Amino acid sequence: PLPPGWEIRIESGSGRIYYYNSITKTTTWERPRL
């Protein structure tokens, strides 16, 4: 998803950007798979 809880981080490997949710402490390698 993309609520005001995710933060923009890029993942080193494939080169895609992913998001970091500091609220629930959830993070995911290149983009959110949900």
Cα 32 from chain centre: 5
Q: How far apart are CA 12 and CA 2, in angstroms?
A: 21
d(CA 32, CA 10): 12
Q: Cα 22 to chain center, whole Å?
A: 10
Which domains does the chain carry? 1-34 (2.20.70.10)
Residue 2 Cα distances to 10, 13, 20, 29, angstroms: 15, 22, 10, 15
Within the chain, what is the greatest distance between any pair of CA atoms? 26
